Amino acid sequence: SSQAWQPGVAMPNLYKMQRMLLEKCDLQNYGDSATLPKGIMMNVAKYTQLCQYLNTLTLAVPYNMRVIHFGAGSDKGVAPGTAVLRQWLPTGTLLVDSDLNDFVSDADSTLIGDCATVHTANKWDLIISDMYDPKTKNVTKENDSKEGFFTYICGFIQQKLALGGSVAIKITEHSWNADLYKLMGHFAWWTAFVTNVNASSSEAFLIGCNYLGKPREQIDGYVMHANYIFWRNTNPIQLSSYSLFDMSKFPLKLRGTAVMSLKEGQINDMILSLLSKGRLIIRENNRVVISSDVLVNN
């Protein structure tokens, strides 16, 4: 583990190519903890390592970058992950966050309620989700693909992610969805990323890098989650907070990526290639308008 000095560990490509069957996840280092810097909370450390890993990918970073963050409230009413995302993102990036429960936030704008009540007019450059329902982690029954908020997330990616944009969506052994894995094949590249501070847990972020709006690759989502569990089961990851102590190169690079508005007939292989290298965003550049549905009754 030269891995201990990385922000985390990504699913190696050879594990993606397997055809494993789903097993129960049994982590060697389950119940260990990393020692966090004094007074630093798990969700700050976790989002910091996630952003540090995203720094190594070909993220498109336009002027007027637009980021939306789902599942951003804590049980203490604040938004630690949102605070890390604002630190990471270029000054002036529009950041909207949301959560079922009320919380106060550093985001430019916040919507409270089930994520299915959230509507936006515009498309987004980067979607981050931390949503998780702890009722799913019941070990006593079959681990099938889950719907709930994952159904919203897949719809939201297909309808509201700009071409070239990227996603990072939290999953676990039991909190996962087969269509979301299938959608990873609609990006130029994908992985499952485990932060070193939370390596004792089956959580990972499914990261889709540079959205292409069409299948580049055909992915069976039940097989790929089985492959992810197999990787985790046979590759213990040493807990580590090492990367948190060097923040000198943390901010996301201002790449000034080009934004163009194109009808879908104009997406040729040359556009696709620019999307694939993080050099192009395709969406409009109008005002960002969002809203929340309110049900009225007595």
């Binding site: 700050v44 630190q87 106060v104 550093d106 943390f250």
Partner: protein
């Protein structure tokens, strides 16, 4: 003429020996920053910790209205630097102290315009 005075209510509860507001969001940073009080990214120096602003605002945290006509919050969406010796009560600190308008440091913990 009635207005609820939450700033005074929190200072009074600190005075009687009450536990400060917790779970202010402390950031990872280099601790080689300018040291100014309220900034767009963490700017803590060797003697400071950096916190996400909204989590350090009394009015945000207590879900009450901000005391000015505009209604605006000048911490939300920013980062506030707290002296490490005061970081047990970031809300109390920001409420009780004042930012220098010329150099941007805290009056009394970094402002050097007065000698």
């Amino acid at each position: 003429a009635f207005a609820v005075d939450a700033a005074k209510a929190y200072k009074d509860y600190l005075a009687s020996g009450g536990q400060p507001i917790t779970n202010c969001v402390k950031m990872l940073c280099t601790h080689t920053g300018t040291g100014q009080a309220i900034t767009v990214t963490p700017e803590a120096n060797m003697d400071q910790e950096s916190f996400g602003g909204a989590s350090c605002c009394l009015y945000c945290r207590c879900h009450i209205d901000h005391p000015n006509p505009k209604g605006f919050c000048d911490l939300k969406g920013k980062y506030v630097q707290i002296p490490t010796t005061c970081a047990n009560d970031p809300v109390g600190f920001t409420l009780k102290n004042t930012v220098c308008t010329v150099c941007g440091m805290w009056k009394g913990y970094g402002c050097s315009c007065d000698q």
